[PDB]
């Protein structure tokens, strides 16, 4: 009936949850541990303030956040009805911050593009152009050295990252770094 989705900031300071469509109130029950096999309404809960945003979604902020507590949430609808509950473990919905201090260097004598900046990374690089044409490379390691068709061209490079275990979100792509030779 009503879907609630959540994301934890890369500083681990808060979790932001969103939902959209009587009077309506998000309630939550925090576990001392995690999420059960099957989420349920619990008699003990607290309300959250949610605010309607211009995209038509309500947004609610949990700050600070208990990263390893299961938050079961639902919408209380006025008799009263409860929407189907869902449970989230905040540490699993982290969106990491982007890799920072991205550097892109061509060394002529070596003949490679050197890029530098537990996680996996994707790198994308292309001729600095217009709408750039991106090639993409994946690292499962700090710094990588790729071949390029042209050692004298200027390339734009971005890196993003995600948990090595595949849980959570990808970061945004870093601010573009530009090669120097």
């Amino acid at each position, epitope marked *: 009936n009503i879907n609630i989705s959540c994301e934890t900031d890369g500083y681990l300071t808060k979790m932001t949850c969103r939902w959209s469509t009587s009077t309506l109130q998000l309630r939550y029950h*925090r576990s001392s541990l995690y999420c059960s096999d099957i989420p349920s309404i619990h008699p*003990i809960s607290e309300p959250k303030d949610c605010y309607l945003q211009s995209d038509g979604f309500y947004e609610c902020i949990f700050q600070p956040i208990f990263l390893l507590s299961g938050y079961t949430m639902w919408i209380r609808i006025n008799g009263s009805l409860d929407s189907p509950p869902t449970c989230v473990l905040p540490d699993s919905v982290v969106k990491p911050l982007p890799p920072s201090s991205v550097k892109a260097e061509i060394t002529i004598n070596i003949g490679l593009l050197k890029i530098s900046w537990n996680l996996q990374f994707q790198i994308r690089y292309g001729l600095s152009g217009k709408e750039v044409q991106w090639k993409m490379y994946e690292v499962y390691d700090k710094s990588v050295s790729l071949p390029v068709p042209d050692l004298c061209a200027v390339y734009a490079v971005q890196v993003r990252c995600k948990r090595l275990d595949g849980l959570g979100y990808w970061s945004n792509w870093s601010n573009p770094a530009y090669t120097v030779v």
Partner: antibody
Amino acid sequence: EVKLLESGPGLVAPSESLSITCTISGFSLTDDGVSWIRQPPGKGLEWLGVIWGGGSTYFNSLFKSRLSITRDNSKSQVFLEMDSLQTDDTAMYYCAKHDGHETMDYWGQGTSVTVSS
Amino acid sequence: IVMTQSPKFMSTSIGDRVNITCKATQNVRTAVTWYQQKPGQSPQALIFLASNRHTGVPARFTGSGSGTDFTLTINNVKSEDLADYFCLQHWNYPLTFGSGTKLEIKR
């Protein structure tokens, strides 16, 4: 480390009021709830009420006509008030911290309250 | 919701094993916590969410059960276990406690 420490009056005369302060450290009152519980001589524990992290307060129906629980986050204090005490309100009085919405993880030292003329 | 502990007292010896039970008058799922209360002291948590150990509680304390029937088991009894043990349900309001079982130790 989490600590709770109650400060109360020791003695309350009949029909007068009980005020107790619970001073906490090692956590924030806005992240978790704090309850009040009492233990009368020779009897079972009795939960009186809670003030949750977000500030909502629930009382035991048996005491709602005469309880207040409030707090001052800035001073890390939670305050109990109970009005119109009588003899059978004599008890040890405790504050205790909650861990989310499923258990109480730490108790205070307790403060003895005797109601007597 | 009433949490009934039928044994008021139980007598054991050093190194034996003891079972302390609590029965709820309604379904409280796994939201049951066991506490130890030594003479002249505050309660301290042993087991929360029916079967999980509080920080620092030795492995010889275990808990089991769900629904209405719960058990704390103390293996390898030691002298410092001299105490009152009682349950809490933390499923709905009012929160309610069992009346306790006092552990007595033969020597």
